[PDB]
Amino acid sequence: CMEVQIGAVRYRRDGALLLAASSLSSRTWGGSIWVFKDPEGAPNESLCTAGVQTEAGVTDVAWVSEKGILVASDSGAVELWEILEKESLLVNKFAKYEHDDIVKTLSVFSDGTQAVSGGKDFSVKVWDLSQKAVLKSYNAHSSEVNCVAACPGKDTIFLSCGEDGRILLWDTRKPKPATRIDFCASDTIPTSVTWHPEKDDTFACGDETGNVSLVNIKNPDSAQTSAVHSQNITGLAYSYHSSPFLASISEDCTVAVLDADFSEVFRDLSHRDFVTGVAWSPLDHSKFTTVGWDHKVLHHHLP
Amino acid sequence: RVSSGRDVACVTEVADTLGAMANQGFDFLCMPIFHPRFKREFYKEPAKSRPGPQTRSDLLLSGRDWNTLIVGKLSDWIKTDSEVSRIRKTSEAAMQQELNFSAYLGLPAFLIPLKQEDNSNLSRLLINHIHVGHHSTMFWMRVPLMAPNDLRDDLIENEPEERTWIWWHNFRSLCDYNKKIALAIEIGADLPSGHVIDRWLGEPIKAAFLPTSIFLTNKKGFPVLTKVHQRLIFKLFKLEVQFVISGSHHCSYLQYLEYLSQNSPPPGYEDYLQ
Amino acid sequence: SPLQPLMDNLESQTYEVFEKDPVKYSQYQQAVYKCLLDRVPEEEKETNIQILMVLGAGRGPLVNASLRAAKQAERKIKVYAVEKNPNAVITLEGWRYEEWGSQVTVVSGDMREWKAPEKADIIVSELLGSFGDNELSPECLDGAQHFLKDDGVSIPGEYTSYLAPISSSKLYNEVRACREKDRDPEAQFEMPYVVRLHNFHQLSDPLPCFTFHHPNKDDVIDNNRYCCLQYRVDLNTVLHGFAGYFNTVLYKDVTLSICPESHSPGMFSWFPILFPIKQPIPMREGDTVCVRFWRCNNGKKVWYEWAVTSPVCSAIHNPTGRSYTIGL
Amino acid sequence: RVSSGRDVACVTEVADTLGAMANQGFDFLCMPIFHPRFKREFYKEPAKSRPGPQTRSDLLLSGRDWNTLIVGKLSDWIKTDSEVSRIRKTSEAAMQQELNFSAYLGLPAFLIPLKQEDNSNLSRLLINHIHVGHHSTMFWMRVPLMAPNDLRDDLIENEPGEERTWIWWHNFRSLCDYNKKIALAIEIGADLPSGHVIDRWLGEPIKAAFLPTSIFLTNKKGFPVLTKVHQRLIFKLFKLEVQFVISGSHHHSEKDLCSYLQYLEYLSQNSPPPNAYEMFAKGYEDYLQSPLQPLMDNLESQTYEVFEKDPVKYSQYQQAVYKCLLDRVPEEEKETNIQILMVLGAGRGPLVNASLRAAKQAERKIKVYAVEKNPNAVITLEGWRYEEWGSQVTVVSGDMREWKAPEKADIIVSELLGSFGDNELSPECLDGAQHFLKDDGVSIPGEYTSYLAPISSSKLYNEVRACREKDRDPEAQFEMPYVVRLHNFHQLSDPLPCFTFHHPNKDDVIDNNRYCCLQYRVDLNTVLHGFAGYFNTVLYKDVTLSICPESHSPGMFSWFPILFPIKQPIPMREGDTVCVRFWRCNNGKKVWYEWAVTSPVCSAIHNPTGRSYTIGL
Ligand SMILES: Nc1ncnc2c1ncn2[C@@H]1O[C@H](CSCC[C@H](N)C(=O)O)[C@@H](O)[C@H]1O
């Protein structure tokens, strides 16, 4: 069956739900990947369409194109799984153990042929999914890499944040790709970053304190910060609206949603443990799904 | 005759991993007793009331195994000197929890990494744990010879040796040079000067960590260290310290260590004090 | 060594010393005076009876200072005089059945365990030590907070301890001679002493250490504290330890303080406290002095742990309260 | 393997004698470093100015050989306790000469025989030599089990009790203040004393046993054979792992010296199998530790493993739950009645499993609550919970005194018993857990009682006396209980019931402060060193556990006894009475014991106000 601690949740461009779970308390610390074409069936393994167990725990998962699935494992490996749809089967294509420590995060570029990895070994690796090998490995962070986010529409630019307190803007063309972004109260440790879909040079970030910040790379003095949560932000996600809402999850077991003006609109206290995932529905633009370590897969709606 | 251990980030199966590293030629295993991602709340509901086990029980291995084969590793998410009050509190609870569990298992050694200069609260909690009953547990302090920020690549356009020594010295001084507190140095791609090296060797080093990434690939696809690294291994040999291999397999690096021994340069009242 | 009125029952002679300062009596009487006028208007001059509780009544003084403050403000109060010291209760029931009357109810027991049959508007206590919280005032009031009304006022409302790096070869050698048999020969350096100002030379202005406010409306009440205080040295001297002072706010604007350059009354109400050091540190000018200070509470004991990390890194003094603790 | 040595009267060539005895099977040689006839003068000419070496050089053997192969022998003409001043003064100078030279050689052991009761001046010279820096040399005191005058043949017309030589050793060791460097080397004669006398000898630090060649009988084949009486003594010496020494000429048999060593090896591989022993082996024989406090401290996994090694405690508790269930729910309520059972102090499991299997054996349904305060043990408890047990067992982490049960229990099962019964604060723990027990609830155990008995043990006393730690009261060691073993002391009288605790306590005002005066009559002339503590308990009706001396109830190997030492040992005559005042105190923060002796001699109250020993909460 599926492990207790659910790690991540990703939506596919048809409604398919992609959840990752890992065992963090039992005698066997493994993991498993699941694909639900019927999101309401989650987390029941009897109502899934495809499921497979990984060699170790899974920290993060991401959709590759439509059939491919990327996996960040405890073994320090990045795994690409393909969905043999209606064979009820998930087949691994490659697993490359490039990181020397747990891969904490990974993001896929828009073209769906490249990806970036964030490791506990301080390493940031850009991947060539087609050739089943890495391109360049970056050691810019002096501590654990928390989150990485590929810039939508730009296959050479991505963001990264780590325990070293750095938020790095990347460009794999320059000899010095990394550029540290600073703003008011950036002294904290950033735990999650994400790009704004409708604004240029703008991203949203969260720290281990509970703050969710809106930062424009150009003119960072107008950065909007808000004490949304009381503990570490564990994920950020924008909606599919023209003026997208910002969903935030944290270790305070709460899920909140801000608008364009950074005012609170939604807040759910239904989770009974660390909510560790959040994703908006491509079908219903008011619907978004969150997962936690309470083995709950909850769906929400905007007022 | 080169006693070596294996450093792992996470163990999916204890019984299987032990036999696997035994076939490779490792003597002991550096593993976390709690899952490195399994963070936990101690004060705030509902995460505080989390059901189920906190970690895998002691009945997975025999008492003999815990006392000879396992070196515990402290969770990295624990930051007892965090400027955030809430985080400092949680870490203090987690620190005591894992220190108590390591002593419960009867572990011979427990890894506690130093990642900064300020480890005041850590030392306070550690010497407290030592003073309150629990005993017979050596405490290996993972301290890199060079700071992680001094070993990173110059890739930040807006942000272009004695440092880590202060980390160890201040912590040991704060701990009043406790006998149960030893040193576990980690070797980077760049080494400090010869004098600094000798100063580190004066400290009670019980283990030397060798990252798999500092090894160069030879003509025949074999691991090899530079002469600079080699001379350090030669000095570590005459201290009879243990070597821990960390990092990814991409695993018989011990062959090169034995190779450096069999063919090591020639030369015990050294501690003697009466 | 600092007296512990909680772990120990004070003698009558000891109480007589504490009751010799008219300043503490006046300021507390003034505090009750102002507090009454602020929580009951003139049109409720007789239809409103304020429930006042003197937590730690001692031999009387705080109860009488509250009664006279009620007459001065022309307000009616129902007094509860609670005390754990059985010997002091005997004195309390002397005033009770000769002077006070049925308006004052004398209670014998701990305020943390006592079950009040009536919530209080005002709680008045004087559990302050030379370092403010060294007599465990927070723990006592926290366990007595439940029977305080939702809009209740606590006197004192808050207090804060202070630390300052000092130099005193005189005080150090006096502590060094405090080696007792059948214990740690260095234990004397790991415990606070009640000293005098003229016996030491302060090296820098005191910084705020720990602050406690009542009633504590925190989520999870914790009295475990930690702070790093840094001071710059302007002379070539030797660090021998740290002086401890405190200031407190009884009611609004009515305060008491033993801080060096304080303009608030109470400068003669308490002797300062001293946290010695094992290895004295000779320092130059321009040097900085960072001290790590801990206040620990394991449920059974309360103590302090301190360490110097600048200019020279010393060792943590009194680890796990091995040399000095405070009862309950 | 049996290590043995050869006692020679004299040695001509040392190198020859070594290799000779080495091929005989010996491991070391007992030889004199000075010639046994080389009597010398010190204070009077012309004999004072004797030229030449005093004895052979040290360069004959290497340091390795001197340190491991040679045991020195003191000259027999040296009599430092002679009533003649000239002889004594000469012997004193001779005594110091051979002692300083034996230490110079780095000898591992040195032989000094005791031939009389008065060895006062011998003691003074010996403990001096130990105190003037020269140490690391064990001193084997050769004392025969029987006096030479008691083993001689009755061949005198005008000149025709066995503890005689015991006084020789006891007085000597006492004068030497029980020094660590002084050991015993018994010499076995043809006649042996009582078995109890032998058992007292074996209690002493025996390092060697001398086997004369004249005690061996010649078999009909010509081989050296010991009598059955001596064989039993050798068997007792085997488990003490002492070394044997053969003294005398091998020409009493038709074979050589090697045959004597083969016979001992023969007895070793044919020695009886040990039981009623081996519990403690190998060993808790000299066990002198402080009682564990599972309440104030969190036990280690290794520690739990030791407690869970006794099948008796598991069986009796399983039997207790078995009988208790059948007695409180009939056969017609075989499935309509669910008994609420709570394991208070579940540890790592055992008590929970013993309750589950007792439910299946009795065919009764139970709802189990497994509570524990040790967070580390709870981790183990939740392993069984989510793999074996299921939802029928609810694991609770916390103190039973503070835990708020959402459901009252029919049966509470706990094992908080110490060596003295209540020394692990079982009453206090159960009293605070009594409220969530039903009005007709059953507690396991239902009751327990501690016992005290006056004992005599110079061995245990001196072990406690050496437990003086720095930075505390130099006499604090005498004011605290120790977990010891039975064979290390001699009980002087039958144990009396001390304190009794029953659960649930239905008293008006529950008080665990206890006081009693226990009196015992002495039937021997001995020395009071302290009091042994035992306990017995009743889990359920008729199902009991006990560590009392002459108890027929199981559990005799489940706990070591406890010892309450005394500061001033009391020498007593027979007919004397021993009244001991014993207190159990509880000030709300600590629990401790206070004891005092008021007969025959009035001592002082030990551990007053728990100044030396307390128990947490
Ligand atoms: N928990 C508690 N319950 C009841 N009374 C208490 C208490 N703690 C302290 N007290 C009482 O309060 C009084 C404090 S007297 C304090 C004197 C003050 N520190 C000074 O130096 O001037 C004592 O008489 C004591 O008996």
Ligand SMILES: Nc1ncnc2c1ncn2[C@@H]1O[C@H](CSCC[C@H](N)C(=O)O)[C@@H](O)[C@H]1O
């Ligand atoms: N007040 C309390 N609350 C909860 N558990 C307790 C407790 N007091 C003791 N325990 C638990 O009960 C267990 C007692 S183990 C006792 C072993 C026994 N004396 C023997 O020698 O064989 C311990 O694991 C301890 O954690």
